[PDB]
Write a protein that binds this ligand. Sequence first.
Ligand SMILES: O=C(Nc1ccnc(NC(=O)C2CC2)c1)c1c(Cl)cccc1Cl
Length: 300
Amino acid sequence: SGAFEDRDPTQFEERHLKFLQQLGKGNFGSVEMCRYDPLQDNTGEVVAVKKLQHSTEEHLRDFEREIEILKSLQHDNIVKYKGVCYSAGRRNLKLIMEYLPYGSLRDYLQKHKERIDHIKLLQYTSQICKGMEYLGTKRYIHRDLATRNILVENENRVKIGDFGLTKVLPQDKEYYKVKEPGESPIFWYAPESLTESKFSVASDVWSFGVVLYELFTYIEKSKSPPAEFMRMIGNDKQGQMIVFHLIELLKNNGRLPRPDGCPDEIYMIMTECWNNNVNQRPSFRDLALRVDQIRDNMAG
Ligand SMILES: O=C(Nc1ccnc(NC(=O)C2CC2)c1)c1c(Cl)cccc1Cl
């Protein structure tokens, strides 16, 4: 036996990370739930563990970029970084984060309407803006805002996750142009992201507007942004034809419809976010203030 000195809590011992459950398998990654049990006493902290399907030089570099980004964020409405695990004898790499019991907001809205009203939706809306205000201070562009990439800790708290697509803005530039292979979340995309692959805080604001739309549809069967845009576009269209028509439609003021039961003031917030003019979209700080004020202005 040997001596031991742990001056790095962000390094998790593969041997002590215990499988509990399989949570998700996306496009490049998958997530499990584990217990970290250094004391071998069958009790430890519960954590979410993300791993790569294929550690290509490119995939790995992205993953490491993603981990640095998460590690650099400390905020109540951003998923907590916990550390990493160099499993397979330190020849593989896994991300250790907080586990959020209720999973994505999208599922939560869907599976727990009994628990959700407009006061909740506003609380969640507010927290997302604040998490987003925080990314801004790091000059991070998330690029993938949607209720599926927001997670529910409990009834009273949601957190932004999914930082795999996040870009850093150089000091002297206000957009990031990213030329990327494969599929895009096109129905969440600002027009300039669609037409020019330009991403910015403003394009995040656009996407946020769509997030706001999703919340007030309560993720109802026919009302998702893809289902609604596809109705407007023609449900039979395929391939690029969908993109062509989406772009043309957005460019000429075609917009998601006000969800049933949704207050005009809230729909108006969506529409301001959905401004073709990039510089005329409100900021996240504008958004959080307006949303908290709407919340505060109620009798209760
Ligand atoms: O990171 C994710 N999901 C998490 C993270 C932490 N905790 C949870 N908690 C749960 O899934 C609970 C419901 C079982 C989910 C995730 C996945 Cl797997 C796919 C796409 C986008 C995202 Cl952000």
